[PDB]
Every structure is written in C-alpha cells, then in structure tokens.
Amino acid sequence: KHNMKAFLDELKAENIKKFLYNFTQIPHLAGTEQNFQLAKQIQSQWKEFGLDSVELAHYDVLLSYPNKTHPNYISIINEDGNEIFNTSLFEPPPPGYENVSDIVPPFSAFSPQGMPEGDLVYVNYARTEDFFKLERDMKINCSGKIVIARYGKVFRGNKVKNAQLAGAKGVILYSDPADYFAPGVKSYPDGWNLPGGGVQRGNILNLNGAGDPLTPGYPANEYAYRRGIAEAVGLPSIPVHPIGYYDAQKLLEKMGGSAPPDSSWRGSLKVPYNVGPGFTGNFSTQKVKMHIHSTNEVTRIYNVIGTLRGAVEPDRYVILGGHRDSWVFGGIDPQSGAAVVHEIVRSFGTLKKEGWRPRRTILFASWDAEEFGLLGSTEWAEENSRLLQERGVAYINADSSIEGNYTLRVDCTPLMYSLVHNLTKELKSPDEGFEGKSLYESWTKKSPSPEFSGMPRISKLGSGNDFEVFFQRLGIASGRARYTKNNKFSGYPLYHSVYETYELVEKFYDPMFKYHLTVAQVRGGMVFELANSIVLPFDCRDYAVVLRKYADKIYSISMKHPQEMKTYSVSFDSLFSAVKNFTEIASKFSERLQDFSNPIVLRMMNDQLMFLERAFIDPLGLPDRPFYRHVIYAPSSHNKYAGESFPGIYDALFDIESKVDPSKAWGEVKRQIYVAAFTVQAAAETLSEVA
Amino acid sequence: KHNMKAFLDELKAENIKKFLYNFTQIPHLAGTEQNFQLAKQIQSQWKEFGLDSVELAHYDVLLSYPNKTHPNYISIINEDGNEIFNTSLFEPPPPGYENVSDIVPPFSAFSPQGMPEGDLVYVNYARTEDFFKLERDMKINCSGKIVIARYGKVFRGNKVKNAQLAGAKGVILYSDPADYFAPGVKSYPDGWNLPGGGVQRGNILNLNGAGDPLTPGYPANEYAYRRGIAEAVGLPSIPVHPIGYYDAQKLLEKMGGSAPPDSSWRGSLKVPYNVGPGFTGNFSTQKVKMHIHSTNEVTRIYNVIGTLRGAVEPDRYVILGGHRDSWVFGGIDPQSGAAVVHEIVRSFGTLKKEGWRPRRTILFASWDAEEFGLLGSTEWAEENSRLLQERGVAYINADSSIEGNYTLRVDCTPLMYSLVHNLTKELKSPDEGFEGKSLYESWTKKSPSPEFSGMPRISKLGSGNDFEVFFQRLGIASGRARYTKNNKFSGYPLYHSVYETYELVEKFYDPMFKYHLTVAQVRGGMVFELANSIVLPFDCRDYAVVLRKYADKIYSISMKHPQEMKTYSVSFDSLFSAVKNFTEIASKFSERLQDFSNPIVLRMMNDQLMFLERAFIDPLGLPDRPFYRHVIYAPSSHNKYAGESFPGIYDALFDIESKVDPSKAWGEVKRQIYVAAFTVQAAAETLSEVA
Ligand SMILES: *[C@@H]1O[C@H](CO)[C@@H](O[C@@H]2O[C@H](CO)[C@@H](O[C@@H]3O[C@H](CO)[C@@H](O)[C@H](O[C@H]4O[C@H](CO)[C@@H](O)[C@H](O)[C@@H]4O)[C@@H]3O)[C@H](O)[C@H]2NC(C)=O)[C@H](O)[C@H]1NC(C)=O
Ligand SMILES: *[C@@H]1O[C@H](CO)[C@@H](O[C@@H]2O[C@H](CO)[C@@H](O[C@@H]3O[C@H](CO)[C@@H](O)[C@H](O[C@H]4O[C@H](CO)[C@@H](O)[C@H](O)[C@@H]4O)[C@@H]3O)[C@H](O)[C@H]2NC(C)=O)[C@H](O)[C@H]1NC(C)=O
Ligand SMILES: *[C@@H]1O[C@H](CO)[C@@H](O[C@@H]2O[C@H](CO)[C@@H](O[C@@H]3O[C@H](CO)[C@@H](O)[C@H](O)[C@@H]3O)[C@H](O)[C@H]2NC(C)=O)[C@H](O)[C@H]1NC(C)=O
Ligand SMILES: *[C@@H]1O[C@H](CO)[C@@H](O[C@@H]2O[C@H](CO)[C@@H](O[C@@H]3O[C@H](CO)[C@@H](O)[C@H](O)[C@@H]3O)[C@H](O)[C@H]2NC(C)=O)[C@H](O)[C@H]1NC(C)=O
Ligand SMILES: *[C@@H]1O[C@H](CO)[C@@H](O[C@@H]2O[C@H](CO)[C@@H](O)[C@H](O)[C@H]2NC(C)=O)[C@H](O)[C@H]1NC(C)=O
Ligand SMILES: *[C@@H]1O[C@H](CO)[C@@H](O[C@@H]2O[C@H](CO)[C@@H](O)[C@H](O)[C@H]2NC(C)=O)[C@H](O)[C@H]1NC(C)=O
Ligand SMILES: *[C@@H]1O[C@H](CO)[C@@H](O[C@@H]2O[C@H](CO)[C@@H](O)[C@H](O)[C@H]2NC(C)=O)[C@H](O)[C@H]1NC(C)=O
Ligand SMILES: *[C@@H]1O[C@H](CO)[C@@H](O[C@@H]2O[C@H](CO)[C@@H](O)[C@H](O)[C@H]2NC(C)=O)[C@H](O)[C@H]1NC(C)=O
Ligand SMILES: CSC[C@H](NC(=O)N[C@@H](CCC(=O)O)C(=O)O)C(=O)O
Ligand SMILES: CSC[C@H](NC(=O)N[C@@H](CCC(=O)O)C(=O)O)C(=O)O
Ligand SMILES: *[C@@H]1O[C@H](CO)[C@@H](O)[C@H](O)[C@H]1NC(C)=O
Ligand SMILES: *[C@@H]1O[C@H](CO)[C@@H](O)[C@H](O)[C@H]1NC(C)=O
Ligand SMILES: *[C@@H]1O[C@H](CO)[C@@H](O)[C@H](O)[C@H]1NC(C)=O
Ligand SMILES: *[C@@H]1O[C@H](CO)[C@@H](O)[C@H](O)[C@H]1NC(C)=O
Ligand SMILES: *[C@@H]1O[C@H](CO)[C@@H](O)[C@H](O)[C@H]1NC(C)=O
Ligand SMILES: *[C@@H]1O[C@H](CO)[C@@H](O)[C@H](O)[C@H]1NC(C)=O
Ligand SMILES: [Ca+2]
Ligand SMILES: [Ca+2]
Ligand SMILES: [Cl-]
Ligand SMILES: [Cl-]
Ligand SMILES: [Zn+2]
Ligand SMILES: [Zn+2]
Ligand SMILES: [Zn+2]
Ligand SMILES: [Zn+2]
C-alpha cells in the first residue's frame, strides 16, 4: 500500500548523508555562480525524482559583499595614527580546505562603509535592557562612541538598531567563549567548539518582514521599480563588523572607565569587562578605528520550486521549504536541512512513480538569499500572495536539521500541536536509552512542557527564517522541527563560521545520520498528513487553550500598573470575552467536524480549518510594521528570533512607565486591546455555522 | 417548477407601490427613533416572508445634526453688523405634510460650528479645474474668503475639500436652476422640478472608504476604542451650509470684482455670476456671515441582515443590499430601492415556502446611515471582513430604483457584463414604443455603448453608495442598476430635498410602478443567477477587453508629455504585457470552463471565478487612501461619485506639469505602472491551471 508508512520507510539515513556531502564541498553564497549551479542541479534532480514541474523563480535583490581588493578590519590606533593592532582579514581555513577559493571573509552584511575612530564602550549583549542599564543606571553615554557587544541572546540586527539609537558611531560584534565554547569540548577540527580565530557572519538588517530592501510589497522582478538606497528598508546607518575572541581579547583587555555592573555582564575571557568609555590611563590616548568597505549590490537570486500535483484538491497547497544559500560551506546551516528536503522529495517521487498522488498539491522550495534577510522566500511569496492567500494550507520550514543531538525541538502554530503529538507517537526515538520507545516518549521526557504534564515543549514561532512571510504576513499555518541541544537564540558554537562543514556533522553531531533521519520523518510526516488527510489535521481547540494563556500573560503585564489601569479605565474584559467565545465556538465546530459522505460539507469544513490561521491577519498590520500582520504572534521588537504573543498590546505596554504622556500611552494600550479582542472574536466567527 | 421565471413572475408592481407608500409617510433619518422602528418592522416582515434568520446588527458611529434650539442660517450683514437679509430656516413643507414633525432642516452633515464673516467668491461648481481657473488664470485668491459654489457635476465633499485647500473660511452650496430645473416642467407639487425654497441636504465628508470617522479599520462595536475628534477621519475644517436658489439669488445679485471667465460659469439666475471677492461699489462694505451650530454625536445605528441559507454551497454569499435611512421622506432615495428589495425578499420567500432553496446563501441587507458616509454597510463589512473575503461571491446594490423614466442604467464590474446582457434579453421592456420587445433592445437603442455597436452602455462603478466597501476595499464583484434620465452626478431635481415624497414618484415618475418592477427584475434576476447558476455567471474575458481599453487610455494621458517620458524612461510596456497575458490566460481558462460531473473541478473553477475580482486588491491600498485597495478602479480623487481606472497611475499623472520636482513625480508614475502591471499579471495567474 501507499500510506504514510510506505513514505516514511523509503527515507534513508545513507541518502541524507550522501546529499549533505554533495551540498557542502564548495561555498554557496547567495548571488554567486556556485549557488546558481547548485540551483540548476537541484532543479534537475527533483525532475528525475519524479515531480510534475520544477522551475527556477529568479529576482534581482539588494545583496552585500566585502570589497575583495580593500579588506575590512579594525585597529587600535595610537596617538600619531599608527595602527598598532589589526584584527584578522580572514578565518584560518579548516584542514583540507586551506585551498578552497571564494570563502567570503567575515563581515556584517549591509553595513555601510566608513572609517569611524573613537573610544570603546562595552554593552554586554547590546539588548534593550543592556542599554537601559548603561544609560539609566550607570549614566554612560554612547553618543559618538564605538560600541563593542558580544553575540548571543538576541538577533544581531536588534543589537545594531539598539546601538544606533543610543548614538553609537560603529558597532563591533564578537563571539565570547562564555556563549560559544562549551566546557570540556575541544575547538574545531578536534571538537565542535569555536576557535579563537572563528567568526560568525550574518546580516544586520531590520526589515520587519519587508523582503528585498528596495521593493517592499512587490516582487523584485524584471520591471520592478526600486527605491533609492536612502529610502531602502532596514539598512543600518553605522558601520558594523564581527570578530573572534582572540581579537576581542586585544580590544577589551585595555578597557577602562566603569566596572561591569554585575556578573551577568562578564564573559569568560581573562579581562575585567569594564564598560569603559575608552581605555585605562596608560592607553587613554589610543583609539579604536574601523575600516569598512563592503558594497550593497542588486544581484540575481534563484529559488527552485517543485510541484507534485494533488489528485483530489490540486488547488490546495502544502509547502515544504528551506533555503540553499550558505555563508560558507553550510554544513549545518542550511545543508543539513536541504539534504533532508532532497530525500523527502525523492521518497514522495518514488511513490508517485508507483502511481500514487497526494490528495492536495505539495510544493517544494529551495529558497535563495535567506542569509541576507529571507529575501528569496519573501519575494516569491510577494509574487504569489493571491494564490497563497486563497489556497495555502500549511508551510513547513526545513532549515538546519540539527543544532544539537539531545532531543527534538518543534515551534509551530497551535493548529498543528495535535498533528505533531500524534505523529511523534508513531515514530521511533533515535536517542540512546530509548531504543524501542517512541519519539514522543523521549522528547516529552527530555523537554517537558512547562504548562502540561506528560506533554512535550512546543514553542511559538518567532522569526529569523523563511516561514516569516507565510506565517506573520500571509497567515498560513506554519511549523518547523529539528534536533536540538539541552541557550536558544545564540546559535551553536560554529554557527555561520567557515568551520561549519560536512566533517563537523559526520564527526561530532550525527555520525549515523539517525537524527537527520528522525527529522526527515517528522518534517516529511507532517507534510504527508497535511497533504493527504481527508479532514485537515488542525485542531482549533488547541488555539483556544493557548489564547487564554496569552491573555492571562498580557493581563499580568498590565497589572504591574494598577494605578494607571484605574486612572485610564484600562479593561481586558473584551479580550477575555473574545477568548471565551472562541473556546465555545471552537468546541462546537469540533463536534460538527467529528459528527458530519458529503464532499461540500467536508471542504466547507476544510476551508474553515485552512482559513482559521488566516483570520488572525489584520490587513492594516502592526504599528510601524505593516508586514507583520498576525495579531496573535509577531517577532519580538527586541529580538527578531523570539516570538511575542499579543505583540500590539505587548509593545504598547513595554517601558510604559517611561513615556512622557501617560494618557496617550495608555490610550494606545486600550486601542491594542480592542484590536486583539475584535480579531479573536472575528476568528472565532469563521468557525460558526456559515449560514 | 422553481426556476428564475417562477421567481420573476411572483414580483408585483402593486406590492412595490404598497411598500413604497408604507416606507415614506414619516422621516427616517439615521440615528432617530423612527428609523429604529422601521428597522424592527423590516426585521419582522422579512421573518414572515420566510428568511431563515433576520437579525439587527447595531454600531455606535459619529453622526451630525443641527441644533434644534439654535438654527443654522446665513446673513448679509451691513457695516454696523445689522443682518439685512437672512436665508431660510426650513424648506416650505409640501402639501399635506405641513404638520409632519421631525423634518430635519437643510444642513451640511459634519460641518464644524462657526460664525465666519467675509467677502464672497463665486467658484462655479468648485471643481479642481474651477479652482485652477480662479487661481492660475484669473489670479483670484480665495484665502480668508467665503466661497459660494453651485451643486452639481461632482460630490459635494470634493467641493468642500477643494475650497478648504484654496484657503476658504466657509462654503455656501446652492442649487442653480441650470442644474436642477428642467425646461418646461413645473416645480413641485405640480411637477418634478426643484422650487426656489427647495434645498439639497447631504454630508460633506472625505472619508475615502473609512466608514465611521472615529473607528477606521474596525467595527464601531460596544468596546471599540475611538479616535478623538481632532484625529477623526474626513471631517471638514470650515463651516458649510446649503441653500435654495431664491436665497442664492440674494447672495449673488450684489457680486462684484471680476466677470465670469466664460459662459460655462453662468447658471440660469438673473445675475451676472461675477466671481467677486465681494460686492459691487454701493455694497462694498456689506459682508456675508454664516451661523453654523450643528453638533457631531456618536449615535446608534441598525442594519437588518436576513439570510436565506444555500442548499448546496451555504458558505458562498450573494448579497443584495441597500440603505433604509433617508434625509426626509426618502420617496426616491432610498425607499424606491428598499421597496424593491422588500418585494424581492417576499418573492424568494414564496419559493422557499414551497420547498426551494437557492444553491448558494443569499444575504439581504437594509443598511443604516448611508446618508452620513456609507457608515452602516462599512462597519458591518469591517466586522465581517474575513467571512466576506473568503466567501463573498457578489454584491448587488439597491438604492434608488429610479432617477428618471427614460432607460436602464447599469454600473458594474466587467465580470458581470455577460450576465447583464443575457438577463436583459429575457426581460420585457417597460418603455412606450417597445411593447413586446426585450429590455436589452430598448436599453441598447436608448443608451448605445460608445465602444461597441449593438451593445448597451454599462459604466464603471464609482462610489457614493453602499457597494464601496465590498468592491473597492474587499474586492467582491459588485453591480447596481436603476432606471435613469436621458447630467449624471448632479442628482435629479428634488434629490435630498423635503419634496422627495411618495407623491413625487406616483404622480411624476412611475405611476404604474412598471419601471420599479423592471428594476426589481434586473436586481432580483442578477441575484437569482449569481446564487443559483452551477458555474458562477462571470466572464473573465470581458475584464480582459476592458483592461486593454484602460491601458490605452492611461498611456494616452501620459503621452501628452513625450519629452518627460523620454527623459525619465517612462515605459508602459510592462502594463501592456500584463494585459496581453491576462487576455491569453483568460481565453484558456474560458475553454476549460466550457470543456470540463466533477464537483471539485467545478468548485475549484468557481473559486477561481470568485477570487478573480479579489486578485485586483493590493493590501497596501492606494497612496494616502488605505481603504481604496482595488488597483483597477477607485473613486475619482476629484469626484467620489465617478470611477477612475488605473487610479494610482492616473493620480500620479494628474497636473504633473505643475510639480516642482519632475524627477520625483515621474518616478512615482513609474512606480504606479509597476504596481498596476504586477497586479494585472498576478490576477491573470489566478486563472492559470492551479498545479
Ligand atoms: C462573546 O459572545 C457574546 C454572544 O454570546 C457577545 O455578546 C454580545 O455582547 C454585546 C456587547 O456587550 C451585546 O451588546 C448589547 O446589545 C444590546 C441589544 O442586543 C444593546 O441594547 C446593548 O446596549 C446597551 O447596553 C450597553 C452596555 O451597558 C450600553 O453601552 C448601551 O448604551 C445600551 O444601553 C449592547 O449593545 C450583545 O447583545 C451580545 N450579543 C448576544 C448576547 O448575542 C459578546 O460581545 C462576545 N464578545 C466579543 C468580544 O465580541
Ligand atoms: C507575460 O508572460 C510572459 C510569459 O509568457 C512573461 O515572460 C517572461 O518575461 C520575463 C521578463 O522579461 C523573462 O525574464 C527573463 O528571464 C530570463 C531567464 O528565463 C533571464 O535570463 C532574463 O534576464 C536577462 O535579460 C534581461 C532583459 O534584457 C536583463 O535585464 C537581465 O540582466 C538578463 O540578462 C529575463 O529575466 C521571462 O523569462 C519570461 N518568461 C517566460 C517566457 O516564460 C512576462 O513577464 C509576462 N508579463 C508580465 C508583465 O509579467
Ligand atoms: C490525534 O489522535 C487522536 C487519537 O486518535 C485523535 O482524536 C480522535 O479522533 C477520532 C476521529 O475523529 C475521534 O473519534 C470520534 O469519536 C466520536 C465519539 O465521541 C464519534 O462521534 C466519531 O464518529 C469518531 O469515532 C476520537 O474521539 C478522538 N480521540 C480523542 C480526541 O481523544 C485526533 O484527532 C488526532 N489529531 C489529529 C489527527 O490532528
Ligand atoms: C450568455 O449567454 C450566452 C449565449 O447562450 C452564453 O454563451 C454560451 O454558453 C454556452 C454554455 O457554455 C456555450 O456552449 C458551449 O459551446 C461549446 C462549443 O464550442 C461546447 O464545447 C460546450 O459543451 C457548450 O455547448 C456557448 O458556446 C456560448 N455561446 C457563445 C459564447 O456565443 C454565455 O455563457 C452567457 N453568459 C453568462 C451565463 O454569464
Ligand atoms: C553532486 O551530485 C551531482 C549529481 O549526482 C553531481 O553532478 C553530476 O556530475 C556528473 C559529473 O560531472 C555529470 O555528468 C552530471 O551531469 C551531474 N548531474 C547533475 C548536475 O544533475 C555533482 O558532481 C556532485 N557534486 C559534488 C561536489 O560531488
Ligand atoms: C595594520 O594594517 C595597516 C594597514 O595595512 C598597517 O599600516 C600600514 O603600513 C604600511 C607599511 O608600513 C604603510 O605603508 C601604510 O601607510 C600603513 N597604512 C595605514 C592605514 O596605517 C599597519 O602596519 C598594520 N599594523 C600592524 C600592527 O600590523
Ligand atoms: C407599514 O406596514 C406595517 C406592516 O403592515 C404596519 O405595521 C403594522 O401595524 C399594525 C397596526 O399598528 C400592527 O398591528 C402590526 O403589529 C404592525 N406590523 C409590524 C410592525 O410588523 C405599519 O403600520 C405601516 N406603516 C404605515 C405608515 O402605514
Ligand atoms: C436675521 O436674523 C437675525 C437673528 O435673529 C435678526 O437679528 C436679531 O434681531 C433681533 C430682534 O430685533 C435682535 O434682538 C437681535 O439682537 C438680532 N440678532 C442678531 C444676531 O443680529 C435679524 O433682524 C434678521 N434679519 C432680517 C432681515 O430679518
Ligand atoms: C540562531 S538560529 C537562527 C537560524 N537563522 C538564521 O541564521 N537566519 C539568518 C537570517 C535571518 C533574517 O535575516 O531574518 C540569520 O539569523 O542571520 C535558524 O533559524 O536556524
Ligand atoms: C447623485 S446620485 C448619488 C446617490 N448617492 C448618495 O446620495 N449618497 C449619499 C452619501 C454618499 C457618501 O457619503 O459617500 C450622498 O451622495 O450624499 C446615489 O448613488 O443614488
Ligand atoms: C574595491 O576597492 C578598490 C579600492 O577602492 C576599488 O578599486 C574598487 O572601486 C572597490 N570596488 C567596489 C567599491 O565595488
Ligand atoms: C550624550 O552625549 C552627546 C554628545 O555630546 C550629547 O549630545 C547628548 O545629549 C548626551 N546625552 C545624554 C543623555 O547625556
Ligand atoms: C552528542 O551527544 C553526546 C552525549 O550526550 C554529547 O556529549 C556530545 O557533545 C553531543 N554532540 C554535540 C555536538 O552536541
Ligand atoms: C443647542 O443650542 C443651545 C444654545 O447654545 C444650547 O442650550 C445647547 O447647548 C445646544 N445643544 C447642543 C450644543 O447640542
Ligand atoms: C492669498 O492671500 C493670503 C491672505 O493674506 C496670502 O497669505 C496668500 O499667500 C495668498 N496667496 C497667493 C497665491 O497670492
Ligand atoms: C416620464 O416620461 C415622459 C415622456 O418622455 C417625460 O416627458 C417625463 O418628464 C418623465 N418623468 C420624469 C420624472 O422624467
Ligand atoms: Ca519585494
Ligand atoms: Ca469602523
Ligand atoms: Cl527550520
Ligand atoms: Cl443603486
Ligand atoms: Zn539557515
Ligand atoms: Zn543562517
Ligand atoms: Zn441613497
Ligand atoms: Zn442619498
């Protein structure tokens, strides 16, 4: 038979390994020839594997690259302007790759050019609260200073935005061993830790869902009208550059001024972690000087889009997508995900060659330019938004399959919780000590839910990956799953470094490719059930439970300000009412879905399930973030990787005790409560009987 | 049998007459008790007629009313401040109504309060080009002047906006006999002409699709957060008041300064039509003084919403809607439309009682507060936008059934052209001289298309009626039809006056109610086919033909500026390409629709037809008009009643030779060409094979 078991059994660890090796021998940086060649290869293979159609969708988007003949670096400069110390021009290449060409040196993509010189201020992780501590509590002024911040905790674009608004004139990002060197493990090539010469690449945009900086709202096709650079979305206004911890030690060791305010500000280097302005007495006249010469350049990118046409509902799309561009070799990020997608396509294609077709259409995507701001997925979604809006069932992401080897990690919409619980109960655990036990059992034991006993942790979707446009802009039910470590937002130690190689994975992460195989079963299994189940496998009652938890949480935040809630008559009654109504209606809808031979009622009902995530979309978007339209979830305004619930109310309450016009600030809290209550009620009403 | 013929034959002229009489004995001003009572009556009758459910949907919206104890009026004031002439405090009531209470006196709804005094400037119709002529050609400065404008040609809100931007400190609107007194017909009560004491009420907002001024985007429900008045949408900043032509004669007869620039500026009164500033020498020291004391007040309004559940596709909605609130008695506007809807409901209910149900769900609506800015329909659509977005097949409007007795008038989306042509070929003409001929034949003879031989005129939808939110905001295929005169935007002579009575209609417009019956057949017939046809009766190829005509037209406008198109490289190639592609794809889709027992393919195909109008929606809206989202059609920025095609490009080109930075202005033209070409291509792609 052709059922999910047939699909799952066809998946092979050995194939995932072969594909990973194949995808990671040379760099595949977005906009380069090597990445176009890999695009064409995947297009050819997906055709051979059996898909109905496989096309490249290309766009011309703003990318950013260092100047090959004018390298980026940072100096300590003495009183006469002699550069007495320079940071590295490249990461030492790993064994056997020392002759690979076209390894892009470390740089912060989209940094403007400049050569700012000044005194350093150390800002810990450069979080919103780190800057509050400096400015409000320690009275340190960052204006006209070069800030040095350690990577970790939040997306680097948020760090740069926060430094910019503090008045910094440049930002230096570095990897501290406290966050990127696990105790008792060796540096790469002998273990999975970051060496002191290693450096994390990454873009520093603040696009808030816009896609290509030059074409917000519309695909960057051949006739697109582009904004000028000065009106581009999301570009930083000060130079930025990342360095390793050998170099950081040299910049930090001389730091003077104030001591760190407490131990949460001290990393693991043998330096005091003084916050500064500037260096200690002997060196008080030395300054730090950046030299940044990278250029932004409109460059063609290529998505591969494969279609397996549905036998019964070809106008319903279940999408499995992940990116293909990498900073260097992409051994984990993204190729451990891409190899998984490739083997899923192969397995579905095997069934198809035996005469099977899924009920609904499955679309497979190899996105480009994810590393430069989710550009490939976003431009494609902009181009196809009307098809996706009216036909998109679900989107499953497929970036890195592993970031550890401890247990499963799933982040998804509540609509998919039951599907995930059920699927994982049917899959074998790959974990040592759980042989013959289900994945559900090992996962629940290692990652217990903080709310529910005997349930595994499933997180909200944040952002920093290609599901953003589908979920937060378009309101298509989305999910992601990977193997993870025992933290969360900093990246594994060799994240976005030249050391992320095939050997890293094969030697230290997943020698048997059993965790990759388990991830292929979870992602592929989800796609299979979404594309094949007669009734869409969404449970609206799970959304009701979570909405109540989020309503309690946002209410609790507001209740830190009881006097203001009295003065301004701030009531959450409408929101709790809406959540109660959603709970009641969802219960009744579930009864009809269980209690209803009628394909019209069925599909009516499948349409109600598909459009439920869609109902949380507000076409006016969130304040000053028009591409974040989901009212229940948005990327945190302080950390793009993290999800925030009731973001419009959350942001209206954030730091409210500091606003100069409390009447106006509390009015806006009330406005956002109205918007949230209305949207919850409206979503509930889509589940009522239709007439 | 239960087919369209059964439905149509059940409709009776005599019933329409009885209902019109019933709806027009007392005023039904929005927000008043009398209008709530009529709401409850219609709700009860629709229940008795057989609908499945009939509910009131209420909202609390900003309305505007004169102060009963402090009347509005205008004076000529002499040098000492003596008021030597005052305009009327009320219209003389018609025969037999001189003891009716609660007739609202003439006023401009939403005018602010004020008592401005100044010299008059006469501005013809106060159109954009009238102000261009005054300011640019005649060098007359309106700053700090009271402007006097004749009604006609464009929506009065546009007049007031144009006066405000010219710097006027007040606006006086009046009805000129040239526009409101047809040669050779008597004044009311002895004919259908406007008497000199008659005055046209009407709101002067510029809401651009927003609905309730205080709650743009969201329904004005019980917990809604409201903007403060100073941030309300669309309110005028200068006092405004309308008067009749006896009063206007007294204000205009003394006018001095410049002569009218040409005869298109002269009405029919025995005055010179001098443009002024101020009065002739003897009276140079007399001024004009307004006294406006109306107040804006949040007030409850009530929509009646009736449902006839579909037997096969209950989650597809075909909506017949028109408003119920009137300025006074509403003899034509809206009750000639409401009586028609009432008889349609009765007829569908008769079939339903015999066991019939339409294929799709039909929703019937009696909207409130249309006269105050389309408030009832818009708030309801805001509340239900997710249901309408995903389930709305079509909206047929049903305001005034007659504005003349000459021939049919239809304005609709191209998707409904074929449906209208076909239906009218099956209906009998009511016209004298066409007995035994079809409505199509009489209509085509009396109102020939300017493009096509042997085809009738069908206009684009503009605005100024309740279809605006459904069509221009939500992208639901919409249409309207009424009997009309042999002009177009000024209103019939007794429009919005106390003289619009049952007797007006029964005596002078439609004594036999045969034109009302013909309109009931066209509106009801359309609803019947939309709700019952197995394949939705839309023809996408008709959109292709019109898109080419609009592309030619906008290209021709740009080509008035050949040097600028060369300098700035302004190409329409992408738009013509998109239109060509749409034509090609629509042709193929039509072949499949003809060539396809399979309910999934059918409904797939019906979904492609239903979502085609939806595809022209841009979620970012038009520049500074976020609620006008349709890229092909928007209300003219110079006249809300009129539709404009390719409005984003049209507005970018308008008066472009006057812009100070031509580079920037032409850049914006190019941007709007990109947006239009992309949206046309995207819409075309929704008609491609789905996978
Ligand atoms: C959750 O679902 C429930 C339905 O089960 C829904 O209940 C509705 O609540 C509204 C708002 O409270 C009710 O609105 C009332 O409607 C009556 C007429 O039906 C009006 O007379 C009421 O107005 C009077 O009272 C107000 C409050 O004191 C005054 O402000 C006002 O001036 C009037 O004097 C009021 O508008 C509505 O009737 C019910 N509908 C029902 C029971 O079917 C509730 O709103 C849902 N929650 C959300 C967040 O949508
Ligand atoms: C109407 O439908 C047609 C399809 O029938 C569609 O045609 C497409 O036009 C685009 C834009 O012209 C073509 O894009 C080209 O794609 C090739 C690869 O396929 C590229 O190599 C081309 O780029 C080169 O040439 C450009 C122009 O000189 C250069 O600017 C560029 O730097 C490159 O050197 C170019 O991107 C596309 O191939 C066709 N698709 C087909 C034929 O299927 C057309 O776009 C539709 N109209 C609209 C308004 O969408
Ligand atoms: C995850 O798996 C669970 C457990 O199988 C699924 O829940 C079960 O779903 C079935 C099918 O709808 C339910 O059966 C129904 O029961 C009622 C009797 O009350 C009957 O009227 C129906 O005809 C049908 O037999 C079953 O009760 C239910 N079990 C539960 C909720 O405990 C669940 O649907 C799966 N989730 C998915 C697929 O998203
Ligand atoms: C308005 O009425 C016209 C005239 O009846 C309708 O057009 C006609 O529609 C029928 C039904 O689709 C077409 O018949 C088809 O013809 C082809 C043969 O080429 C055949 O393959 C199909 O099986 C079917 O018989 C007919 O050709 C067509 N006539 C035309 C276009 O001249 C039109 O659909 C109506 N518009 C509506 C209902 O919106
Ligand atoms: C990755 O695998 C692909 C496909 O097996 C290899 O590409 C093939 O290479 C052979 C030898 O050059 C050619 O004859 C085929 O035409 C290629 N097939 C394609 C591109 O579809 C590719 O060599 C492998 N890359 C690495 C680094 O091993
Ligand atoms: C850091 O790099 C800079 C730039 O290459 C070095 O400074 C240059 O040294 C060369 C050779 O002596 C001079 O000709 C250039 O004029 C210098 N350029 C600048 C910008 O100062 C510097 O020597 C390096 N410092 C260290 C410690 O190696
Ligand atoms: C319009 O018609 C309605 C319905 O026929 C009339 O309302 C009815 O009036 C009688 C006498 O008062 C009552 O017994 C019924 O309860 C009413 N029915 C309703 C409201 O559904 C109404 O009188 C008529 N109005 C005019 C001006 O003739
Ligand atoms: C126009 O109306 C105004 C306002 O009612 C009249 O002026 C008033 O006249 C009364 C009675 O003489 C005075 O007590 C008030 O002080 C006046 N009010 C104002 C505002 O001037 C005026 O007489 C009327 N003019 C004409 C020509 O009838
Ligand atoms: C810290 S894990 C983040 C990783 N995501 C990414 O690296 N995304 C890229 C690009 C994200 C973006 O531009 O939104 C990045 O964070 O620099 C993942 O989701 O696996
Ligand atoms: C000149 S005919 C206009 C008539 N429409 C209306 O009167 N609409 C009302 C309200 C329109 C609006 O506020 O958009 C008006 O124009 O004042 C109609 O469409 O029959
Ligand atoms: C790279 O640097 C060298 C030195 O300025 C220069 O010749 C070239 O313009 C630069 N390339 C760019 C800016 O793309
Ligand atoms: C920080 O220093 C700058 C640089 O002179 C100054 O302009 C700014 O006002 C300072 N801000 C505070 C809070 O002291
Ligand atoms: C794999 O698992 C082992 C055993 O717990 C752990 O010690 C090792 O470091 C893991 N590898 C990685 C990269 O986490
Ligand atoms: C109406 O006018 C009289 C006189 O100002 C006044 O008593 C009352 O306040 C007014 N009503 C309003 C402003 O609603
Ligand atoms: C119109 O008159 C006003 C009033 O003094 C003046 O301020 C304004 O600049 C004038 N505009 C023109 C075009 O003359
Ligand atoms: C009705 O039709 C007649 C005949 O053409 C016309 O003269 C009369 O004025 C019409 N009534 C109205 C209100 O147009
Ligand atoms: Ca874009
Ligand atoms: Ca509103
Ligand atoms: Cl992922
Ligand atoms: Cl109408
Ligand atoms: Zn990645
Ligand atoms: Zn990455
Ligand atoms: Zn009307
Ligand atoms: Zn009206």
Swiss-Prot record, chains A, B:
Positions of the catalytic residues: E370, S571, D607, H630
Post-translational modification: The first two amino acids at the N-terminus of isoform PSMA' appear to be cleaved by limited proteolysis.
Keyword presence, rRNA processing: no
Induction section of the entry: In the prostate, up-regulated in response to androgen deprivation.
Gene Ontology MF terms: Ac-Asp-Glu binding; carboxypeptidase activity; dipeptidase activity; metal ion binding; metallocarboxypeptidase activity; peptidase activity; tetrahydrofolyl-poly(glutamate) polymer binding
Protein name per its UniProtKB record: Glutamate carboxypeptidase 2
Activity regulation info: The NAALADase activity is inhibited by beta-NAAG, quisqualic acid, 2-(phosphonomethyl) pentanedioic acid (PMPA) and EDTA. Activated by cobalt.
Task of the protein: Has both folate hydrolase and N-acetylated-alpha-linked-acidic dipeptidase (NAALADase) activity. Has a preference for tri-alpha-glutamate peptides. In the intestine, required for the uptake of folate. In the brain, modulates excitatory neurotransmission through the hydrolysis of the neuropeptide, N-aceylaspartylglutamate (NAAG), thereby releasing glutamate. Involved in prostate tumor progression.
Effect of N99A: Loss of glycosylation. Severely reduced enzyme activity
Membrane topology term: Single-pass type II membrane protein
Enzyme class: hydrolase
Domain writeup: The NAALADase activity is found in the central region, the dipeptidyl peptidase IV type activity in the C-terminal.
Binding site for Zn(2+) 1: H323, D333, D399
Binding site for Zn(2+) 2: D333, E371, H496
Binding sites annotated in the UniProt record for substrate: R156, N203, E370, S463, G464, N465, R480, A481, R482, Y495, H496, K640, Y641
Source organism of this protein record: Homo sapiens
Cofactors named for this entry: Zn(2+)
UniProt EC number: 3.4.17.21
Ranges in the topological domain labelled Extracellular: 1-691
Cofactor: binding comment: Binds 2 Zn(2+) ions per subunit. Required for NAALADase activity.
